[PDB]
A paper describes a structure:
Within S. pyogenes, Prx functions to inhibit the quorum-sensing receptor-signal pair ComRS, the master regulator of natural competence, or the ability to uptake endogenous DNA. ComR is a quorum-sensing receptor and a transcription factor that belongs to the Rgg subgroup of the RRNPP protein family, many of which regulate virulence in pathogenic Streptococcus species. ComR is a monomer that contains a DNA-binding domain (DBD) packed against a tetratricopeptide repeat (TPR) domain. Specifically, Prx binds directly to the apo-form of ComR preventing DNA binding in vitro and acts as a repressor of the S. pyogenes competence regulon in vivo.
Despite not being able to obtain an X-ray crystal structure of Prx in complex with full-length ComR, we were able to cocrystallize Prx with the DBD of ComR. DBD:Prx cocrystals were obtained with both purified minimal DBD bound to Prx and after in situ proteolysis with full-length ComR complexed with Prx. The crystals grew in similar conditions and both diffracted to 1.65 Å and 1.60 Å, respectively. The obtained complexes are nearly identical except for differences in space group (P212121 and P41212) and their cloning and protease digestion artifacts. Analysis of the DBD:Prx complex interface reveals that Prx directly interacts with the DNA-binding surface of ComR. The interaction is highly electrostatic in nature, with Prx using a large negative surface consisting of conserved acidic residues to complement the conserved positive DNA-interaction face of the ComR DBD. Specifically, Prx utilizes D32 to make hydrogen bonds with both the essential arginine residues R33 and R37 in ComR that are responsible for DNA recognition. Furthermore, residue D32 is the focal point for a stabilized hydrogen bonding network that positions Prx E44 to make a salt-bridge with ComR R33, Prx D38 to salt-bridge with ComR R37 and for the arginine side chains to be further stabilized by hydrogen bond interactions with the Prx mainchain. This binding network is extended across the full face of the DBD:Prx interaction by Prx E6 making a hydrogen bond with the invariable ComR residue K49 and Prx E9 providing a mainchain hydrogen bond with ComR T44. If the DBD:Prx complex is aligned to apo-ComR using the DBD, we observed that Prx is unable to interact with the DNA-binding residues of ComR due to a large steric clash as this surface is held tightly against the TPR domain.
Author numbering:
A (entry chain C): 64 to 68
B (entry chain B): 1 to 66
C (entry chain A): 1 to 60
The structure:
């Protein structure tokens, strides 16, 4: 979802 | 489909000795930020941007699709 | 040009956080957004705008 996750 | 679009357009741009700014010309259709986001995969390419970029790099869009 | 799907993706991926966002307009039309780490050129006109109001305007 959120970047780097 | 355009999932690998960013990597391919970056490769072709660098091949032709072009900066992102040169691809974006007067930035009336594409900002340097938007091209950067597409090349890094931050932003999914939309149709108008993908076709504009393909034309700026001298190829049909089919050269750049998955 | 800023697609509603592009804006929504930047929110979904956590690049556009919070209630407000920096917007570039050209010829009266929303042209782009600007994230905190990105640069703008001197001739680009930047406004701080409400995310939900940008969404309304783009959805039209």
């Amino acid at each position: 979802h959120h970047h780097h996750h | 489909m355009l999932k690998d679009f960013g990597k391919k357009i970056k490769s072709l741009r660098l091949e032709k000795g072009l900066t992102k700014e040169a691809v974006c010309l007067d930035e009336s259709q594409l900002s340097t930020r938007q091209l950067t986001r597409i090349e890094s995969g931050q932003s999914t390419p939309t149709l108008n941007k993908a076709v504009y970029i393909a034309g700026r790099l001298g190829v049909t869009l089919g050269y750049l699709t998955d």
